[PDB]
């Protein structure tokens, strides 16, 4: 559920979806900044980049009930609404972005 779900697979999958969505945005700009040679090899990154491009073409986002897209928009909507200084996935990402 979108609620305080405690199921461990939900924990890892939801946090990985959000982290790879942000990686897909990052890595799309990074790739576009070169436009002639690749800069990534993470197996799931290309799938999430495709899901992100779909969310850009999409018109329902959340009601676009397809597992990957509906999930993608629910996690990124959480990240958009977030108060991030003390959240279970927010705090990790904040440490994962301490420098650039
Ligand atoms: Zn990547
Ligand atoms: Zn969609
Ligand atoms: Zn959060």
CSV table of N, CA and C and ligand atoms in Angstrom, one decimal:
chain,number,residue,atom,x,y,z
A,1,UNK,N,0.8,-1.2,0.0
A,1,UNK,CA,0.0,0.0,0.0
A,1,UNK,C,0.9,1.3,0.0
A,2,UNK,N,0.2,2.4,-0.3
A,2,UNK,CA,0.9,3.7,-0.3
A,2,UNK,C,1.1,4.2,1.2
A,3,UNK,N,0.5,3.5,2.1
A,3,UNK,CA,0.6,3.7,3.6
A,3,UNK,C,1.9,3.2,4.2
A,4,UNK,N,2.1,3.1,5.5
A,4,UNK,CA,3.2,2.7,6.2
A,4,UNK,C,3.5,1.1,6.1
A,5,UNK,N,3.5,0.6,4.9
A,5,UNK,CA,3.7,-0.8,4.6
A,5,UNK,C,5.1,-1.3,5.2
A,6,UNK,N,5.1,-2.4,6.0
A,6,UNK,CA,6.3,-2.9,6.6
A,6,UNK,C,6.9,-4.1,5.9
A,7,UNK,N,6.3,-4.7,4.9
A,7,UNK,CA,6.8,-5.8,4.1
A,7,UNK,C,8.2,-5.4,3.5
A,8,UNK,N,9.2,-6.2,3.9
A,8,UNK,CA,10.6,-6.0,3.5
A,8,UNK,C,10.8,-5.8,1.9
A,9,UNK,N,10.1,-6.5,1.1
A,9,UNK,CA,10.2,-6.4,-0.4
A,9,UNK,C,9.8,-5.0,-0.8
A,10,UNK,N,8.7,-4.5,-0.2
A,10,UNK,CA,8.2,-3.1,-0.4
A,10,UNK,C,9.3,-2.1,0.0
A,11,UNK,N,9.9,-2.2,1.1
A,11,UNK,CA,11.1,-1.4,1.6
A,11,UNK,C,12.2,-1.3,0.5
A,12,UNK,N,12.8,-2.4,0.2
A,12,UNK,CA,13.9,-2.4,-0.8
A,12,UNK,C,13.4,-2.0,-2.2
A,13,UNK,N,12.2,-2.5,-2.7
A,13,UNK,CA,11.8,-2.1,-4.0
A,13,UNK,C,11.4,-0.6,-4.1
A,14,UNK,N,10.7,-0.1,-3.2
A,14,UNK,CA,10.2,1.3,-3.2
A,14,UNK,C,11.5,2.3,-3.1
A,15,UNK,N,12.4,2.0,-2.2
A,15,UNK,CA,13.6,2.8,-2.1
A,15,UNK,C,14.5,2.7,-3.3
A,16,UNK,N,14.6,1.5,-3.9
A,16,UNK,CA,15.4,1.3,-5.1
A,16,UNK,C,14.7,2.0,-6.3
A,17,UNK,N,13.4,2.0,-6.4
A,17,UNK,CA,12.6,2.7,-7.5
A,17,UNK,C,13.0,4.2,-7.4
A,18,UNK,N,12.8,4.8,-6.3
A,18,UNK,CA,13.0,6.2,-6.1
A,18,UNK,C,14.5,6.5,-6.4
A,19,UNK,N,15.5,5.8,-5.8
A,19,UNK,CA,16.9,6.0,-6.0
A,19,UNK,C,17.3,5.9,-7.5
A,20,UNK,N,16.7,4.9,-8.2
A,20,UNK,CA,17.0,4.7,-9.7
A,20,UNK,C,16.2,5.7,-10.6
A,21,UNK,N,15.1,6.2,-10.1
A,21,UNK,CA,14.4,7.3,-10.8
A,21,UNK,C,15.2,8.6,-10.8
A,22,UNK,N,15.8,8.9,-9.7
A,22,UNK,CA,16.7,10.0,-9.5
A,22,UNK,C,17.9,9.8,-10.3
A,23,UNK,N,18.5,8.6,-10.2
A,23,UNK,CA,19.6,8.2,-11.1
A,23,UNK,C,19.3,8.3,-12.6
A,24,UNK,N,18.1,7.9,-13.0
A,24,UNK,CA,17.7,8.0,-14.4
A,24,UNK,C,17.6,9.5,-14.8
A,25,UNK,N,17.1,10.4,-14.0
A,25,UNK,CA,17.1,11.9,-14.3
A,25,UNK,C,18.5,12.4,-14.5
A,26,UNK,N,19.3,12.1,-13.5
A,26,UNK,CA,20.8,12.4,-13.4
A,26,UNK,C,21.5,12.0,-14.7
A,27,UNK,N,21.4,10.7,-15.0
A,27,UNK,CA,22.1,9.9,-16.0
A,27,UNK,C,21.5,10.3,-17.4
A,28,UNK,N,20.2,10.7,-17.5
A,28,UNK,CA,19.7,11.3,-18.8
A,28,UNK,C,20.3,12.6,-19.1
A,29,UNK,N,20.5,13.5,-18.1
A,29,UNK,CA,21.2,14.8,-18.3
A,29,UNK,C,22.7,14.6,-18.6
A,30,UNK,N,23.3,13.7,-17.9
A,30,UNK,CA,24.7,13.3,-18.0
A,30,UNK,C,25.0,12.8,-19.4
A,31,UNK,N,24.1,11.9,-19.9
A,31,UNK,CA,24.2,11.3,-21.3
A,31,UNK,C,24.0,12.4,-22.3
A,32,UNK,N,23.0,13.2,-22.2
A,32,UNK,CA,22.6,14.3,-23.1
A,32,UNK,C,23.7,15.4,-23.2
A,33,UNK,N,24.5,15.5,-22.1
A,33,UNK,CA,25.6,16.5,-22.0
A,33,UNK,C,26.8,16.0,-22.9
A,34,UNK,N,26.8,14.8,-23.4
A,34,UNK,CA,27.9,14.3,-24.3
A,34,UNK,C,27.3,14.0,-25.7
A,35,UNK,N,26.2,13.2,-25.7
A,35,UNK,CA,25.4,12.9,-27.0
A,35,UNK,C,26.1,12.0,-28.0
A,36,UNK,N,27.3,11.4,-27.7
A,36,UNK,CA,28.0,10.6,-28.7
A,36,UNK,C,28.6,9.3,-28.1
A,37,UNK,N,28.7,9.2,-26.8
A,37,UNK,CA,29.3,8.0,-26.0
A,37,UNK,C,28.5,7.8,-24.7
A,38,UNK,N,28.3,6.5,-24.3
A,38,UNK,CA,27.7,6.1,-23.1
A,38,UNK,C,28.5,6.5,-21.9
A,39,UNK,N,27.9,6.6,-20.7
A,39,UNK,CA,28.5,6.9,-19.4
A,39,UNK,C,27.9,6.0,-18.2
A,40,UNK,N,27.1,5.0,-18.5
A,40,UNK,CA,26.5,4.1,-17.5
A,40,UNK,C,26.3,2.6,-18.1
A,41,UNK,N,26.3,1.7,-17.1
A,41,UNK,CA,26.2,0.2,-17.4
A,41,UNK,C,25.3,-0.5,-16.4
A,42,UNK,N,24.7,0.2,-15.4
A,42,UNK,CA,23.8,-0.4,-14.4
A,42,UNK,C,22.5,-1.0,-15.1
A,43,UNK,N,22.3,-2.4,-15.0
A,43,UNK,CA,21.2,-3.0,-15.7
A,43,UNK,C,19.8,-2.4,-15.6
A,44,UNK,N,19.4,-2.0,-14.4
A,44,UNK,CA,18.1,-1.4,-14.1
A,44,UNK,C,18.0,0.1,-14.5
A,45,UNK,N,19.1,0.8,-14.7
A,45,UNK,CA,19.1,2.2,-15.1
A,45,UNK,C,18.4,2.5,-16.4
A,46,UNK,N,18.7,1.7,-17.4
A,46,UNK,CA,18.0,1.8,-18.8
A,46,UNK,C,16.5,1.6,-18.7
A,47,UNK,N,16.0,0.7,-17.9
A,47,UNK,CA,14.6,0.4,-17.7
A,47,UNK,C,14.0,1.6,-17.0
A,48,UNK,N,14.6,2.1,-15.9
A,48,UNK,CA,14.1,3.3,-15.2
A,48,UNK,C,14.2,4.6,-16.1
A,49,UNK,N,15.2,4.8,-16.9
A,49,UNK,CA,15.3,5.9,-17.9
A,49,UNK,C,14.1,5.7,-18.9
A,50,UNK,N,13.7,4.5,-19.3
A,50,UNK,CA,12.5,4.3,-20.2
A,50,UNK,C,11.2,4.7,-19.5
A,51,UNK,N,11.1,4.3,-18.2
A,51,UNK,CA,10.0,4.6,-17.3
A,51,UNK,C,9.8,6.1,-17.1
A,52,UNK,N,11.0,6.8,-16.9
A,52,UNK,CA,11.0,8.3,-16.7
A,52,UNK,C,10.5,8.9,-18.0
A,53,UNK,N,11.1,8.6,-19.2
A,53,UNK,CA,10.6,9.1,-20.5
A,53,UNK,C,9.1,8.8,-20.7
A,54,UNK,N,8.6,7.6,-20.3
A,54,UNK,CA,7.2,7.4,-20.3
A,54,UNK,C,6.5,8.3,-19.4
A,55,UNK,N,6.9,8.5,-18.1
A,55,UNK,CA,6.3,9.5,-17.2
A,55,UNK,C,6.2,10.9,-17.8
A,56,UNK,N,7.2,11.3,-18.7
A,56,UNK,CA,7.2,12.6,-19.3
A,56,UNK,C,6.1,12.7,-20.4
A,57,UNK,N,5.9,11.6,-21.2
A,57,UNK,CA,4.9,11.4,-22.2
A,57,UNK,C,3.5,11.2,-21.6
A,58,UNK,N,3.4,10.6,-20.5
A,58,UNK,CA,2.2,10.2,-19.7
A,58,UNK,C,1.3,11.4,-19.4
A,59,UNK,N,0.0,11.2,-19.2
A,59,UNK,CA,-1.0,12.2,-18.9
A,59,UNK,C,-1.8,11.9,-17.6
A,60,UNK,N,-1.8,10.6,-17.1
A,60,UNK,CA,-2.5,10.3,-15.8
A,60,UNK,C,-1.4,10.2,-14.7
A,61,UNK,N,-0.2,9.7,-15.0
A,61,UNK,CA,0.8,9.5,-14.0
A,61,UNK,C,0.5,8.4,-13.0
A,62,UNK,N,-0.4,8.7,-12.0
A,62,UNK,CA,-0.9,7.9,-10.9
A,62,UNK,C,-2.0,6.9,-11.4
A,63,UNK,N,-2.9,7.4,-12.1
A,63,UNK,CA,-4.1,6.7,-12.7
A,63,UNK,C,-3.6,5.8,-13.9
A,64,UNK,N,-2.4,6.1,-14.4
A,64,UNK,CA,-1.7,5.3,-15.5
A,64,UNK,C,-1.2,4.0,-14.8
A,65,UNK,N,-2.1,3.3,-14.1
A,65,UNK,CA,-2.1,2.1,-13.3
A,65,UNK,C,-1.1,1.0,-13.7
A,66,UNK,N,-0.4,1.1,-14.8
A,66,UNK,CA,0.7,0.1,-15.2
A,66,UNK,C,1.7,0.1,-14.0
A,67,UNK,N,2.0,-1.1,-13.5
A,67,UNK,CA,2.8,-1.3,-12.3
A,67,UNK,C,4.0,-0.3,-12.2
A,68,UNK,N,4.9,-0.3,-13.2
A,68,UNK,CA,6.1,0.5,-13.2
A,68,UNK,C,5.8,2.0,-13.2
A,69,UNK,N,4.9,2.5,-14.1
A,69,UNK,CA,4.6,4.0,-14.2
A,69,UNK,C,3.9,4.5,-13.0
A,70,UNK,N,2.8,3.8,-12.6
A,70,UNK,CA,2.0,4.2,-11.4
A,70,UNK,C,2.9,4.2,-10.2
A,71,UNK,N,3.8,3.2,-10.0
A,71,UNK,CA,4.7,3.2,-8.9
A,71,UNK,C,5.7,4.4,-9.0
A,72,UNK,N,6.3,4.6,-10.2
A,72,UNK,CA,7.3,5.7,-10.4
A,72,UNK,C,6.7,7.0,-10.0
A,73,UNK,N,5.5,7.3,-10.4
A,73,UNK,CA,4.8,8.6,-10.1
A,73,UNK,C,4.5,8.7,-8.6
A,74,UNK,N,4.1,7.6,-8.0
A,74,UNK,CA,3.8,7.6,-6.5
A,74,UNK,C,5.1,7.9,-5.7
A,75,UNK,N,6.2,7.3,-6.0
A,75,UNK,CA,7.5,7.6,-5.4
A,75,UNK,C,8.1,9.0,-5.6
A,76,UNK,N,8.0,9.4,-6.9
A,76,UNK,CA,8.5,10.8,-7.2
A,76,UNK,C,7.5,11.8,-6.6
A,77,UNK,N,6.2,11.6,-6.5
A,77,UNK,CA,5.3,12.5,-5.9
A,77,UNK,C,5.6,12.6,-4.4
A,78,UNK,N,5.9,11.4,-3.7
A,78,UNK,CA,6.4,11.5,-2.3
A,78,UNK,C,7.7,12.4,-2.2
A,79,UNK,N,8.7,12.2,-3.1
A,79,UNK,CA,9.9,13.0,-3.1
A,79,UNK,C,9.6,14.5,-3.3
A,80,UNK,N,8.7,14.8,-4.2
A,80,UNK,CA,8.2,16.2,-4.5
A,80,UNK,C,7.6,16.9,-3.2
A,81,UNK,N,6.7,16.1,-2.5
A,81,UNK,CA,6.0,16.6,-1.3
A,81,UNK,C,6.9,16.5,0.0
A,82,UNK,N,7.9,15.7,0.0
A,82,UNK,CA,8.8,15.4,1.1
A,82,UNK,C,9.3,16.7,1.9
A,83,UNK,N,9.6,16.4,3.2
A,83,UNK,CA,10.2,17.3,4.2
A,83,UNK,C,11.6,16.8,4.6
A,84,UNK,N,12.1,16.0,3.7
A,84,UNK,CA,13.3,15.1,3.6
A,84,UNK,C,14.4,15.0,4.7
A,85,UNK,N,14.5,15.9,5.6
A,85,UNK,CA,15.5,16.0,6.7
A,85,UNK,C,15.5,14.7,7.6
A,86,UNK,N,14.4,13.9,7.6
A,86,UNK,CA,14.2,12.8,8.5
A,86,UNK,C,13.2,11.7,7.9
A,87,UNK,N,13.4,11.3,6.6
A,87,UNK,CA,12.5,10.3,6.0
A,87,UNK,C,13.4,9.0,5.6
A,88,UNK,N,12.9,7.8,5.7
A,88,UNK,CA,13.6,6.5,5.5
A,88,UNK,C,14.4,6.3,4.2
A,89,UNK,N,14.1,7.1,3.2
A,89,UNK,CA,14.7,7.0,1.9
A,89,UNK,C,15.3,8.3,1.5
A,90,UNK,N,14.7,9.4,1.9
A,90,UNK,CA,15.1,10.8,1.8
A,90,UNK,C,16.5,11.0,2.5
A,91,UNK,N,16.6,10.6,3.8
A,91,UNK,CA,17.9,10.7,4.5
A,91,UNK,C,19.0,10.0,3.8
A,92,UNK,N,18.9,8.7,3.4
A,92,UNK,CA,19.9,7.9,2.6
A,92,UNK,C,20.3,8.7,1.3
A,93,UNK,N,19.3,9.2,0.5
A,93,UNK,CA,19.6,10.0,-0.7
A,93,UNK,C,20.3,11.3,-0.4
A,94,UNK,N,20.0,11.9,0.7
A,94,UNK,CA,20.7,13.1,1.2
A,94,UNK,C,22.1,12.9,1.5
A,95,UNK,N,22.5,11.7,2.1
A,95,UNK,CA,23.8,11.3,2.3
A,95,UNK,C,24.5,10.8,1.0
A,96,UNK,N,23.7,10.2,0.1
A,96,UNK,CA,24.1,9.8,-1.3
A,96,UNK,C,24.4,11.0,-2.2
A,97,UNK,N,24.1,12.2,-1.8
A,97,UNK,CA,24.2,13.5,-2.5
A,97,UNK,C,24.9,14.6,-1.7
A,98,UNK,N,25.7,14.2,-0.7
A,98,UNK,CA,26.5,15.1,0.2
A,98,UNK,C,27.4,16.0,-0.6
A,99,UNK,N,27.9,15.5,-1.7
A,99,UNK,CA,28.8,16.3,-2.7
A,99,UNK,C,28.4,15.9,-4.1
A,100,UNK,N,28.9,16.8,-5.1
A,100,UNK,CA,28.7,16.7,-6.5
A,100,UNK,C,29.9,17.2,-7.3
B,1,LIG,ZN1,22.7,5.4,-15.2
B,2,LIG,ZN1,2.1,6.4,-17.6
B,3,LIG,ZN1,10.6,11.5,2.2
